Enzyme design. Structure first.
Site, PDB file in Angstrom:
ATOM      1  N   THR A 176       0.824  -1.202   0.000  1.00  0.00           N
ATOM      2  CA  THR A 176       0.000   0.000   0.000  1.00  0.00           C
ATOM      3  C   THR A 176       0.862   1.258   0.000  1.00  0.00           C
ATOM      4  O   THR A 176       0.445   2.307   0.489  1.00  0.00           O
ATOM      5  CB  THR A 176      -0.944   0.038   1.214  1.00  0.00           C
ATOM      6  OG1 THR A 176      -0.174   0.173   2.415  1.00  0.00           O
ATOM      7  CG2 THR A 176      -1.769  -1.238   1.286  1.00  0.00           C
ATOM      8  N   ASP A 223       6.038  -1.324  -2.169  1.00  0.00           N
ATOM      9  CA  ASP A 223       6.184  -2.157  -0.987  1.00  0.00           C
ATOM     10  C   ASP A 223       5.678  -3.564  -1.304  1.00  0.00           C
ATOM     11  O   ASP A 223       5.403  -3.902  -2.458  1.00  0.00           O
ATOM     12  CB  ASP A 223       5.437  -1.538   0.191  1.00  0.00           C
ATOM     13  CG  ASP A 223       3.935  -1.649   0.043  1.00  0.00           C
ATOM     14  OD1 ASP A 223       3.364  -0.928  -0.802  1.00  0.00           O
ATOM     15  OD2 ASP A 223       3.325  -2.471   0.758  1.00  0.00           O
ATOM     16  N   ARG A 237       3.749  -5.504   1.582  1.00  0.00           N
ATOM     17  CA  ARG A 237       2.799  -5.949   2.601  1.00  0.00           C
ATOM     18  C   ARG A 237       1.383  -5.840   2.045  1.00  0.00           C
ATOM     19  O   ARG A 237       0.669  -4.854   2.243  1.00  0.00           O
ATOM     20  CB  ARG A 237       2.952  -5.137   3.880  1.00  0.00           C
ATOM     21  CG  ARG A 237       3.772  -5.800   4.972  1.00  0.00           C
ATOM     22  CD  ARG A 237       3.641  -5.019   6.272  1.00  0.00           C
ATOM     23  NE  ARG A 237       4.335  -5.659   7.383  1.00  0.00           N
ATOM     24  CZ  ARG A 237       4.277  -5.242   8.640  1.00  0.00           C
ATOM     25  NH1 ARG A 237       3.578  -4.171   8.981  1.00  0.00           N
ATOM     26  NH2 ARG A 237       4.942  -5.911   9.577  1.00  0.00           N
ATOM     27  N   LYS A 247       3.407  -5.576  -6.765  1.00  0.00           N
ATOM     28  CA  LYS A 247       2.684  -4.334  -7.007  1.00  0.00           C
ATOM     29  C   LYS A 247       3.216  -3.554  -8.202  1.00  0.00           C
ATOM     30  O   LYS A 247       2.623  -2.533  -8.562  1.00  0.00           O
ATOM     31  CB  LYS A 247       2.717  -3.455  -5.754  1.00  0.00           C
ATOM     32  CG  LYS A 247       1.860  -3.992  -4.619  1.00  0.00           C
ATOM     33  CD  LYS A 247       2.296  -3.457  -3.267  1.00  0.00           C
ATOM     34  CE  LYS A 247       1.467  -4.076  -2.153  1.00  0.00           C
ATOM     35  NZ  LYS A 247       2.139  -3.991  -0.829  1.00  0.00           N
ATOM     36  N   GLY A 293      -4.671  -0.227  -3.665  1.00  0.00           N
ATOM     37  CA  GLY A 293      -6.093  -0.374  -3.418  1.00  0.00           C
ATOM     38  C   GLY A 293      -6.536  -1.822  -3.481  1.00  0.00           C
ATOM     39  O   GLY A 293      -5.855  -2.705  -2.949  1.00  0.00           O
ATOM     40  N   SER A 348      -1.789   3.748   0.645  1.00  0.00           N
ATOM     41  CA  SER A 348      -2.071   4.194   2.006  1.00  0.00           C
ATOM     42  C   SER A 348      -0.891   4.956   2.595  1.00  0.00           C
ATOM     43  O   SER A 348      -1.078   5.973   3.275  1.00  0.00           O
ATOM     44  CB  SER A 348      -2.434   2.998   2.885  1.00  0.00           C
ATOM     45  OG  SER A 348      -3.602   2.352   2.411  1.00  0.00           O
ATOM     46  N   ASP A 359       3.646   3.592   7.876  1.00  0.00           N
ATOM     47  CA  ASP A 359       2.317   3.113   7.533  1.00  0.00           C
ATOM     48  C   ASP A 359       2.153   1.685   8.036  1.00  0.00           C
ATOM     49  O   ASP A 359       3.116   0.917   8.102  1.00  0.00           O
ATOM     50  CB  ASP A 359       2.054   3.179   6.019  1.00  0.00           C
ATOM     51  CG  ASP A 359       0.636   2.778   5.649  1.00  0.00           C
ATOM     52  OD1 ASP A 359       0.267   1.600   5.842  1.00  0.00           O
ATOM     53  OD2 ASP A 359      -0.121   3.650   5.177  1.00  0.00           O
ATOM     54  N   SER A 398       2.256  -1.522   4.813  1.00  0.00           N
ATOM     55  CA  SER A 398       3.356  -1.631   3.867  1.00  0.00           C
ATOM     56  C   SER A 398       4.607  -2.093   4.599  1.00  0.00           C
ATOM     57  O   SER A 398       4.856  -1.679   5.734  1.00  0.00           O
ATOM     58  CB  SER A 398       3.615  -0.294   3.165  1.00  0.00           C
ATOM     59  OG  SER A 398       2.494   0.094   2.392  1.00  0.00           O
TER      60      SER A 398
END
Lengths: 220, 243, 238, 204, 240, 234, 250, 232
Positions: free
Chosen positions: A1, A17, A19, A33, A47, A129, A166, A169
């Site tokens: 995120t 990232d 996670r 990602k 997302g 995020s 965060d 992540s």
């Protein structure tokens, strides 16, 4: 995120990232990602991971068809416009926020794409995020026309800040560099977080557990 | 004298005994039915389309019968055959070019536009319920990394890249002139290219055309927008070739 | 999208497609149907017995419900689809009425289907003539015959397919009220009617019988053999 | 809560070159248990099992539709399914109902048809691919199962130790959960055999 | 047969005989002429009087397809009415989508494309009508486009469609219509249409005449009556 | 084949409709007589074989309690139109709380008639014209009425009409023996004697179907006993 | 369109249907297919015509396909029609499997195919599928069972039948040399070899010219085995030996 | 647009699709092409004889890829080839989208065959006038497929479509080995092409694609003329 992208003197550097979490607990530490689209186009999704993956796959297939029909290399602009129009047709119901980086005939391009369909061409873009930490790192340590190593270090620091500030992540960082000449995609770029070994190893053997029925069906 | 026909083989585009499509090959002479010859050439950095302007009557506004159509800013085209078919194909090409521009974020390459138009023509050839648009289009443009480009579709749909070609009643004679010119000279500048373009029409058709009897379009790498020559440039090129 | 008018009025208002469907019915296999006072009997010539063949799949007599059955004459595949559609109509009626189906209603809607195919675009009518046997609520035997033209009529006894006219003209003279009193006489009448059509007499023939709501069953081959022997006994004494 | 409407727990980890997949056996409404012999692990191949968790109706429907399309593909193509292809196909199947999602989070486990390399992966209600080398878990027992696995799992396990580890994982993850358990079915896919076992778990 | 049965097939040479028959059907009809000048575009169409029981202004071959665009037709008059309806529908669509009156050039181009679109499929037949559209604009001036049944639209200083079209063209060539005055050109149109009319061929006849131009405030209109009698008198005098 | 379903003749008429009329004269003979005391319909059954049940051979159908119909021609094709007419009459009753007038029923039947083609409407439509001539006998607010429905859609209100195999000639003889002030008994007697005279075969109760509509009574079909009672005097 | 239509979905003046007749004739000159029933299984013998040395021949079978878990098919005629038909049959068989959680009965699937083929002949304006189908399979209700269908939409159940050239001769050989109820797999295989040798006498029996398939029921499981090239060579050798023995005894 | 619902292709009294035979005749009258298999790959070769040199023979391409591991060539009509290759590209992309794995060449050829069969049995349409030579690599294996206008397909180790196609097939059979290398495959393909070129082949007039474990890739005129020089 926590995904990010930047344009340096030569091309585009993308970072993400790993996670991938559903609900609140970590579901995976090795999420991909940074999706491949074309040998000169990559995109980072944040997302709803399924929506991002399907979107990237569809865009990759469409640009494969386009480039193979036209005999030219795929363009970042055509990918960005297709992403915009498709997401806008679905009015943002596709929970995908994307960072589209790549190098085309007209030069390196970086685009920030929002799920509602809005897009913007920006030298440095953060999404997810933990986007705010990476965005702050960029605003603090970004320069125009940076070298390859400087861009790599800046993206690594941005992803590290997003990871450490965060709760969605971490556990790895993924990097992908696209240039006029070479494309590099190093997934385990740097693992800033390790795991200590179990101080007391506890193992079991057959007879420690209780089993009711066995059924062997040998195969060939 | 016993004008028999072999059922519907010669009537609608279905496979003939000789492995041919009769209504597809009728379109080749349907190009000739227009009675107009259009020849196009490309230079090292320029592409010129030269077409004679027919004036069957003064009573029509000859300033509004120009047959050169701008598909986009940087793409010009000219067609041979049925003029209504030519207008329909120009409209379809404009629609496809704009659609590509919106859907892909950059100007349509001329080769891809020709390929799409050829696929549409093949849609007509494949279907047995429509007139297969007996009109031939030739288009020009300036392409990065490849230079000036000229492409030509056809009612059959078999297109190809080329230095120069022609469509019309005397397309074969223009083809012969292009053969002799390419075998004679190779290095072409802008003025040499335009002079050869004028010479093709002059030698092939032998009309000694007036300045108002042609319409000429050019694309150059100084302002790649397709621009049409007016009477001043036509007279300038005419006198330059004459001297 | 296929809507070419196939069934159109030829000169003099003759439906040549209907005539060709009738020709296909005539060239088809032979079937007969009798409506006895207690039972209804269908007899189909199993022509070209062609041994090493599972006759169960080619059985031209198919039951639609516990009180309704039909035997066709004409195209086997059109017969199969019409039988499927008749199963659909019978089940739909049973659902929407929760009452036992009516033989006349079934035959009527099959006739309506045939007439729709005659009146439809891009379609040709079903080249089959069907003999529908059955029993009403009160156990009244019912025998109806419908043709590809769409007309259906109730008959005491009739025949369809190859030799249909000869068989029906034989039956109209051989049919008496007292000759169908019991199942034995009905079976003998049907067997002697089909004997003029089938060369084998007992092995290229199949018989089905339905009683008054009593779970119709197909006649056994041994029963067919012994009843052909019985009709030969009647022949030798007569 | 819709995926916890009936309850569920499925897991799959890897051995040295073998695979272990296990699932709970309790089926019932949110409150009462109806059947304790429900099947939740289904064979998509000779060396490929799939476990489904979530709404029981969606589990059954997704399994049926997956078997439909898988059998069609394998009859058209003539080779046993590749685990990656099966995972991608089921992920696409779930994504086809983006606006009508099946409330199921499945996991796929098995071996390469020719290489016999262990493969395990997980999805969600939309069908997000999630390939993790160590283990994948799904169902209402997700937190318990993750906590168990992240300490009980080690790389390069023999089939017997693999079975012991996964059996302990299911037993100790369902005994602390209320909407799952009442029997555990475990499938161990080795190189040349598969062992199906029922654990002696607490039925309540 | 085979080469003249439908518009979806070529002749063995590549001709469209259905369109040629449409040209025949528009040629054998009554004459219709349109002259554009520097300050107006006029139309004079010839009306065949089947019987005197008809009204003047019945079965008009002059349509008013836009607020500033006329339409002089020849050929099948029902087909002409349908084409006028299509033209006014296109003008309405352009006005709705762009907030201003459609230019005549694009109007004629779109209508010609529509006409050609119904000359491609065997499911339709080519229109049996040719039509001339005249309009005026403050920035464009007086404009006149003639459209064939095939679907070809060209600008004409002056055009004629019908039986005596070529004679009308040839005798009116003496007029330098490109810089003339609309009022006197109306009288000259009355003249030319009277000479090109064959009284022996058609004993009974009538004229429908109109203009659009700067004198109309850029809106299409019919000739006022008084100018109609004055032009009729001039034409009678020119008959000699 | 070659000729379409929407093709006229050189003199300007549909030869398909002409073929339909020819099929009309190929149909069974039917007779309808309207009087001031009601309307009567009759038809010859044309029994092929005695094995055929006379019950299923009925060319007279009830459209409503006050309307009866006689069909001649493609009897299979006529039942669809009959069902449509009945459902339309019941729709009119459902909408306006009154029995649908016979003239409106005939107009609606004409609306359904001559609605066919290859590609002219929804594909699930008719391909050929109805090949059945109809006689709508009925009683409504306008007293007893009788309508000749031609398959051409040219519906006619006629006091008495004979159609079918022996339409012409028999219709003229019926007109000659028909008057403008005949009772219902006179009407049925005249129709029965004309039908008996024009019968191609020896007729009895099993060869004809008879029905009537009365101003007071509903649409009633003559059973065998009353058929014999009325035919014994003739 | 009236003149230029082919109107292949209408009747004929004499009541036949020319399109299905032509399809059957083309199937007659097409490849050879044979199906037979044994007390413990059912056997298929399919003959491949195009046998150029340029073939990769990597496929397990050319005209023999697997409709579903417990039923195999042999096609005769146009192989592209065969491919589209076969995958449609697989689709609908798996549809029945999904809908009922039970293997689709062979009679069910044959009836469905004959329904769709009959409808495609009935209307649509298209030329019918000129491919004959011969289906074998096992079911709960009748076990080993094989059907022959026709492009006209008609099907029949047989103990053994053949399609292709010399069909009458082949069926005569079956009627002469088939032991009903007492046909084991070995004797059935020998009869199939005899038919393959005789019904196509031109280009006498060759290993690569034909393909052999078997369908058996072992441990409640339907097993479809395609006999390999060495197996076909063994069949050829056995046929030659038995023919030589019969001739010497003669 | 209405659309004819009657299939233009119909069964002749003998059952032969004479329309498909005419399509194959058009294929034969079209430009010839050859395809050949090696023990570790496939090579497709064809000639592009344009008119006099006024045509830019470099601008247009005849060998076309579908994926990174599949290419094809045609013999017949270019207009049909363009739409057919475009549809095949769409089918491959859709399969990759659904299953996240490269299209097998056999399945792609099956889809193309289904498309051709739909074209032949549908109404208002002309059968395709091309024969496709499809090269593909998947699961570490080579694949070469013949697909005819009739809609059928075959896996052929060597093939030659177009003019003198039977003689090309015989020549390939004579000069084909079971365990040859890619170099031998290129030698054989170029030898067949020059034996049936009729007019002194040139690097521009010959365009060749190679498909192996590294994927599918079209040889540029440099190495093209290099191989022609090595083969003589």
């Amino acid at each position: 995120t926590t995904i990010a992208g930047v344009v340096y003197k030569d091309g585009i550097v993308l970072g993400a990232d790993t996670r991938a979490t559903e609900g609140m607990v970590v579901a995976d530490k090795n999420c991909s990602k940074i999706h491949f689209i074309s040998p000169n186009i990559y995109c980072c999704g944040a997302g709803t991971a399924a929506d991002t993956d399907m979107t990237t796959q569809l865009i990759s297939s469409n640009l494969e068809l386009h480039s193979l029909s036209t005999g030219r290399l795929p363009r970042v602009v055509t990918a960005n416009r297709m992403l915009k129009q498709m997401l806008f047709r679905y009015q943002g119901y596709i929970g995908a926020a994307l960072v589209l980086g790549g190098v085309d005939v007209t030069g390196p391009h970086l685009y920030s794409i929002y799920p509602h369909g809005s897009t913007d061409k920006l030298p440095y873009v953060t999404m997810g995020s933990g986007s705010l930490a990476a965005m702050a790192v960029f605003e603090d340590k970004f320069r125009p026309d940076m070298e390859e190593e400087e861009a790599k270090n800046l993206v690594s620091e941005a992803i590290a800040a997003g990871i450490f500030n965060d709760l969605g992540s971490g556990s790895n960082i993924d990097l992908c560099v696209i240039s006029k000449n070479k494309l590099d995609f190093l997934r385990p770029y740097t693992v800033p977080n390790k795991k200590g070994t179990r101080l007391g190893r506890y193992r079991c053997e057959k007879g420690t557990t209780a089993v009711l029925t066995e059924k062997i069906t040998p195969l060939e | 004298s016993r004008g028999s026909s072999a059922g519907f083989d010669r009537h609608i585009t279905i496979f003939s005994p000789e492995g041919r499509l009769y209504q597809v090959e009728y379109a080749f002479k349907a190009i000739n039915q227009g009675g107009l010859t259009s020849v196009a050439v490309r230079g090292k950095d320029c592409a010129v389309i030269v077409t004679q302007k027919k004036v069957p009557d003064k009573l029509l506004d000859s300033s509004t019968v120009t047959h050169l159509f701008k598909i986009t800013e940087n793409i010009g085209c000219v067609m041979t055959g049925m003029t209504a078919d030519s207008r329909s194909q120009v409209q379809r090409a404009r629609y496809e070019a704009a659609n590509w521009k919106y859907k892909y974020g950059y100007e349509i390459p001329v080769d891809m536009l020709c390929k799409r138009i050829a696929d549409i023509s093949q849609v007509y050839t494949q279907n047995a319920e429509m007139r297969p648009l007996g009109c031939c289009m030739i288009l020009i443009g300036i392409d990065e990394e490849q230079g000036p480009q000229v492409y030509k579709c056809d009612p059959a749909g078999y297109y190809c890249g080329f230095k120069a070609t022609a469509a019309g009643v005397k397309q074969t004679e223009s083809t012969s002139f292009l053969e002799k010119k390419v075998k004679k000279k190779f290095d072409w500048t802008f003025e040499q290219t335009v002079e050869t373009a004028i010479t093709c029409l002059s030698t092939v058709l032998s009309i000694d055309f007036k300045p108002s009897e042609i319409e000429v379009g050019v694309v150059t790498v100084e302002n790649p927008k397709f621009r049409i020559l007016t009477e001043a440039e036509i007279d300038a090129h005419l006198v330059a070739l004459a001297e | 999208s296929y809507d070419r008018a196939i069934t159109v009025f030829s000169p003099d208002g003759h439906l040549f497609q209907v005539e060709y469907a009738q020709e296909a019915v005539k060239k088809g296999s032979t079937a007969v149907g009798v409506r006895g006072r207690d039972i209804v009997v269908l007899g189909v010539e199993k022509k070209s017995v062609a041994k090493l063949q599972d006759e169960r799949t080619v059985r031209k007599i198919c039951a639609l419900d516990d009180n309704v059955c039909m035997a066709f004459a004409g195209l086997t595949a059109d017969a199969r689809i019409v039988i499927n559609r008749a199963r659909v109509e019978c089940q739909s009626h049973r659902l929407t009425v929760e009452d036992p189906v009516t033989v006349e209603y079934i035959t009527r809607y099959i006739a309506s289907l045939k007439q729709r195919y005659t009146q439809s675009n891009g379609r040709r009518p079903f080249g089959i003539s069907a003999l529908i046997v059955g029993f009403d609520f009160d156990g009244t035997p019912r025998l109806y015959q419908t043709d590809p033209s769409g007309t259906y009529h109730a008959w005491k006894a009739n025949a369809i397919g190859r030799g249909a006219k000869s068989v029906r003209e034989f039956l109209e003279k051989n049919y008496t009220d007292e000759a169908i009193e019991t199942d034995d006489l009905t079976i003998k009448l049907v067997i002697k009617a089909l004997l003029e059509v089938v060369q084998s007499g007992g092995k290229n023939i199949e018989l089905a019988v339905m009683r008054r709501d009593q779970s119709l069953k197909i006649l056994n081959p041994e029963e067919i053999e012994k009843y052909v022997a019985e009709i030969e006994k009647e022949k030798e004494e007569n | 809560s819709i995926m916890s409407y009936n309850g569920g727990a499925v897991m799959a980890m890897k051995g040295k070159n073998c695979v272990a997949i296990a699932a709970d056996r309790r089926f019932g409404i949110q409150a009462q248990m109806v059947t304790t012999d429900f099947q939740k692990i289904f064979p998509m191949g000779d060396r490929l099992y799939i476990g489904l968790a979530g709404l029981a109706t969606d589990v059954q429907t997704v399994a049926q539709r997956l078997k439909f399309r898988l059998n069609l593909y394998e009859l058209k193509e003539g080779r046993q399914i590749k685990p990656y292809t099966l995972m991608s196909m089921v992920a696409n199947l779930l994504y086809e109902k983006r606006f009508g999602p099946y409330y199921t989070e499945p996991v796929i486990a098995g071996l390469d048809p020719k290489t016999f390399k262990p493969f395990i992966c997980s999805l969600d209600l939309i069908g997000c691919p999630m390939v993790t080398d160590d283990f994948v878990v799904s169902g209402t027992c997700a937190e318990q199962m993750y906590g168990m696995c992240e300490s009980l799992w080690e790389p390069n396990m023999d089939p017997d130790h693999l079975f012991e580890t996964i059996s302990q994982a299911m037993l100790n993850a369902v005994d602390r959960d209320a909407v799952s358990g009442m029997g555990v079915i475990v499938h161990i896919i080795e190189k040349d055999k598969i062992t199906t076992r029922t654990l002696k778990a607490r039925m309540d | 047969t085979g080469y003249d049965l439908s518009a979806s097939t070529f002749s063995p040479d590549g001709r469209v005989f259905q369109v040629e028959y449409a040209m025949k059907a528009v040629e054998n009809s009554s004459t219709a002429i349109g002259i554009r000048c520097k300050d107006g575009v006029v139309f004079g169409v010839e009306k065949l009087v089947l019987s005197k029981l008809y009204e003047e202004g019945s079965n008009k071959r002059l349509f008013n397809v836009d607020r500033h665009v006329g339409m002089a037709v020849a050929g099948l008059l029902a087909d002409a009415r349908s084409l006028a309806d299509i033209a006014r529908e296109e003008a309405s669509n352009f006005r709705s989508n762009f907030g201003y009156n459609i230019p005549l050039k694009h109007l004629a181009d779109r209508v010609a494309m529509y006409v050609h679109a119904y000359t491609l499929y065997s499911a339709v037949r080519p229109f049996g009508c040719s039509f001339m559209l005249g309009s005026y604009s403050v920035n464009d001036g007086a404009q006149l486009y003639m459209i064939d049944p095939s679907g070809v639209s060209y600008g004409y200083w002056g055009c004629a469609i019908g039986k005596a079209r070529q004679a009308a063209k040839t005798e009116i060539e003496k007029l330098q219509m490109k810089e003339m005055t609309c009022r006197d050109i109306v009288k000259e149109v009355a003249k030319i249409i009277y000479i090109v009319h064959d009284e022996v061929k058609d004993k009974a006849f009538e004229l429908e005449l109109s203009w659009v131009g700067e004198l109309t405030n850029g809106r299409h209109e019919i000739v006022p009556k008084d100018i109609r009698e004055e032009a009729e008198k001039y034409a009678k005098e020119s008959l000699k | 084949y070659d000729r379409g379903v929407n093709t006229f003749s050189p003199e300007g008429r549909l030869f398909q409709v002409e073929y339909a009329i020819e099929a009309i004269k190929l149909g069974s003979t039917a007779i309808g007589i309207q009087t001031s005391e009601g309307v009567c319909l009759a038809v010859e059954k044309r029994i092929t074989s005695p094995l055929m049940e006379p019950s299923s051979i009925e060319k007279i159908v009830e459209i409503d309690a006050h309307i009866g119909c006689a069909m001649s021609g493609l009897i299979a094709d006529a039942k669809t139109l009959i069902d449509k007419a009945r459902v339309e009459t019941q729709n009119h009753w459902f909408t306006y709380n009154e029995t649908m007038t016979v003239e409106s029923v005939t107009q609606a039947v004409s609306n359904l008639a001559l609605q066919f083609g290859e590609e002219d409407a929804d594909p699930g439509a008719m391909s050929r014209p109805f090949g059945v001539a109809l006689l709508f006998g009925g009683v409504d607010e306008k007293g007893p009425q009788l309508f000749h429905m031609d398959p051409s859609g040219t519906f006619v209100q006629c006091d008495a009409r004979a159609i079918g195999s022996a339409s012409e000639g028999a219709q003229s003889s019926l007109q000659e023996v028909y008057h403008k002030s005949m009772t219902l008994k006179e009407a049925i007697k005249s129709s029965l004697i004309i039908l008996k005279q024009v019968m191609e075969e020896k007729l009895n109760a099993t060869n004809i179907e008879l029905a009537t509509v009365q101003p007071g009574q509903n649409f009633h079909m003559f059973t065998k006993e009353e058929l014999e009672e009325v035919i014994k005097d003739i | 369109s009236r003149r230029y239509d082919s109107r292949t979905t209408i009747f004929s003046p004499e009541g036949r249907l020319y399109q299905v007749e032509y399809a059957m004739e083309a199937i007659g000159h097409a490849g050879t297919c044979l199906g037979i029933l044994a007390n413990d299984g059912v056997l298929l013998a399919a003959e491949r015509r195009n046998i150029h040395k340029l073939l990769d021949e990597v496929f397990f079978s050319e005209k023999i396909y697997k409709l579903n878990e417990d039923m195999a098919c042999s096609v005769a005629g146009i192989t592209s029609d065969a491919n589209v038909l076969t995958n449609e049959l697989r689709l609908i068989a798996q549809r029945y499997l999904l809908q009922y959680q039970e293997p689709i009965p062979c009679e069910q699937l044959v009836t469905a195919l004959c329904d769709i083929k009959q409808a495609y002949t009935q209307f649509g304006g298209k030329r019918p599928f000129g491919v004959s189908l011969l289906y074998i399979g096992w079911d709960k209700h009748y076990g080993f069972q094989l059907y022959q269908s026709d492009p006209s939409g008609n099907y029949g159940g047989w103990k053994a039948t053949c399609i292709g050239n010399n069909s009458a001769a082949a069926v005569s050989m079956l009627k002469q040399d088939y032991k009903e109820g007492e046909m084991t797999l070995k004797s059935a295989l020998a009869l199939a070899i005899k038919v393959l040798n005789k019904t196509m006498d031109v280009s006498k029996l060759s290993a690569e010219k034909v393909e052999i398939a078997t369908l058996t029921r072992e441990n409640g499981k339907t097993v479809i085995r395609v006999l390999k090239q060495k197996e076909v060579e063994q069949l050829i050798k056995k046929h030659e030996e038995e023919e030589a023995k019969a001739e010497r005894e003669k | 647009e209405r659309g004819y619902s009657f299939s233009l292709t119909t069964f002749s009294p003998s059952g032969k699709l004479v329309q498909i035979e005419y399509a194959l005749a058009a294929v034969a009258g079209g430009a010839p092409s050859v395809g050949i298999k090696a023990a570790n790959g496939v090579v497709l070769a064809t000639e592009k004889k344009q008119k006099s040199i006024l045509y830019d023979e470099r601008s247009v391409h005849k060998v076309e890829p579908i994926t990174k591991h599949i290419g094809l060539v045609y013999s017949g009509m270019g207009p049909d080839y363009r739409v057919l290759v475009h549809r095949a590209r769409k089918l491959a992309q859709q399969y990759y989208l659904v299953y996240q794995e490269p299209i097998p060449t056999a399945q792609l050829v099956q889809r193309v065959a289904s498309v051709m069969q739909e074209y032949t049995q549908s109404g208002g349409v002309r059968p395709f006038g091309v024969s496709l030579l499809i090269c593909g690599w998947n699961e570490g294996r080579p694949y070469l497929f013949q697909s005819d206008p009739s809609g059928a397909y075959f896996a052929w180790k060597a093939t030659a479509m177009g003019k003198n196609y039977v003689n090309g097939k015989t020549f390939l059979e004579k000069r084909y080995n079971e365990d040859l290398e890619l170099e031998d495959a290129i030698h054989t393909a170029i030898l067949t092409l020059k034996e049936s070129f009729e007019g002194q082949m040139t690097e521009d007039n010959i365009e060749v694609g190679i498909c192996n474990e590294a994927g599918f890739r079209r040889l540029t005129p440099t190495e093209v003329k290099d191989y022609l020089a090595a083969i003589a």
